[PDB]
Automatic annotation (TrEMBL), chains A, B:
Protein residues bound to Ca(2+) 5: 187-188
Gene3D superfamilies for the chain: Alpha carbonic anhydrase (3.10.200.10)
Listed name of the protein: Carbonic anhydrase
Originating organism: Persephonella marina (strain DSM 14350 / EX-H1)
Catalytic activities: hydrogencarbonate + H(+) = CO2 + H2O
Residues that, per the record, bind Ca(2+) 1: 39, 187-188, 221
Sequence positions that bind Zn(2+): 86, 88, 92, 105
Length: 222, 222
């Protein structure tokens, strides 16, 4: 019964269930304000994506797009399979104290269940032609799920400059499990103001967890 | 008789001499707050530098390091010869409303006198080993100029990531001539807090012109 507003909101997430305890005691939580940055010789990240987005689900907390097996990234010489991507507005991560109006998360998992999430910022700009295909068909109520007519390639929502920030964090929604590899891309993408407004309107407001303390962590920059 | 403080300061520069009129009527002035940015497919910039820094001059307004002929950059298929590089603190340019504590300018000129300046931001970090060589020998008073023992290569003060912001602007000190190509590098370099403090102490304070209106301009990002 968790939410982004009111008494089941982010500050109370850890109180709600035993399984959500990391939202309360965790010291490596996401998102964060990216303001303690260090240059590091990170390897480039192999992105082996095919066209494979199939369904669009409104779950009350976001719009989630599911992906068929076969698409993956390689981080630390390990294959993490793309499972789904979804959205928040405004951005969950901040960059040196500032938000973007929107952020996408591409959620991946290796064979043992370890999670790697690619985060992509979006600013106000040209209509995103890939997001229009999903937005046209966006379910208006929680629980609804539409099948997509044409399969979408998620690689088209990623920038061509693939320099990125890296850090060790968590899921941004309960249970907020830790041990998540975060790959936040430096280069932003574009969306129309209308697309942003539609997403906010349908979600009913802000869909962003507050930034959490960096604590012992640093953010690595390629 | 211009300065960075008081009644001969930046707000009054255009009042001081007829030759300084651009500081008053100019609509394409530098520096600027880099907050209206557009992605653009800018060509990479050829940097053909040799070891060639010879002298270190304190001129009351900065520390200026002079360069022997033979080192150049290529912008718009034109050779601009490196003449000198110098410093300001805090940064002249801002990035999305925020300063860096220090900024370097590498001043170049083509055969007809057209200026191209490469700007490099520096943050607090490790001692810069190339700046230490200059700092050791830094003239304490205006008018003084020391010959360097060992020639320095300016290329070592530039980042290895050479993605850059570009815009059309001006000199940041009187006469503030326009028609200057600005190449401001995206990746920052590092300096020690001690090196910054030494430069500020010797200059006697802030050495940065206030940001000027972007006006009709955009900033291009590679
Ligand atoms: Ca950096
Ligand atoms: Ca880059
Ligand atoms: Ca972009
Ligand atoms: Ca950009
Ligand atoms: Ca750096
Ligand atoms: Zn998310
Ligand atoms: Zn300068």
């Amino acid at each position: 019964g968790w939410s982004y507003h009111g008494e089941h909101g982010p500050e109370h997430w850890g109180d709600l269930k035993d399984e959500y305890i990391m939202c309360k005691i965790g010291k490596n939580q996401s998102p964060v304000d990216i303001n303690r940055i260090v240059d590091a010789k990170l390897k480039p990240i192999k992105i082996e994506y095919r066209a494979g987005a199939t369904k669009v689900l409104n779950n009350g907390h976001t719009i989630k797009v599911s992906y068929e097996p076969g698409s993956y990234i390689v981080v630390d010489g390990i294959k993490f399979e793309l499972k789904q991507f979804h959205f928040h507005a405004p951005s969950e991560h901040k960059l040196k104290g500032q938000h973007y109006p929107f952020e996408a998360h591409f959620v991946h998992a290796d064979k043992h269940g370890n999670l790697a999430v690619i985060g992509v910022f979006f600013k106000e700009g040209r209509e995103n032609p890939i997001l229009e295909k999903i937005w046209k068909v966006m379910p208006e109520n929680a629980g609804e799920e539409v099948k997509l007519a044409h399969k979408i390639n998620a690689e088209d929502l990623l920038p061509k400059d693939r320099d990125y920030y890296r850090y060790s964090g968590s899921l941004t929604t309960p249970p907020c499990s830790e041990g998540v590899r975060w790959i936040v891309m430096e280069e932003e993408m574009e969306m129309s103001k209308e697309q942003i407004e539609k997403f906010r309107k349908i979600m009913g407001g802000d869909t962003n967890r507050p930034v959490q303390p960096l604590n012992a962590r640093m953010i690595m920059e390629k």
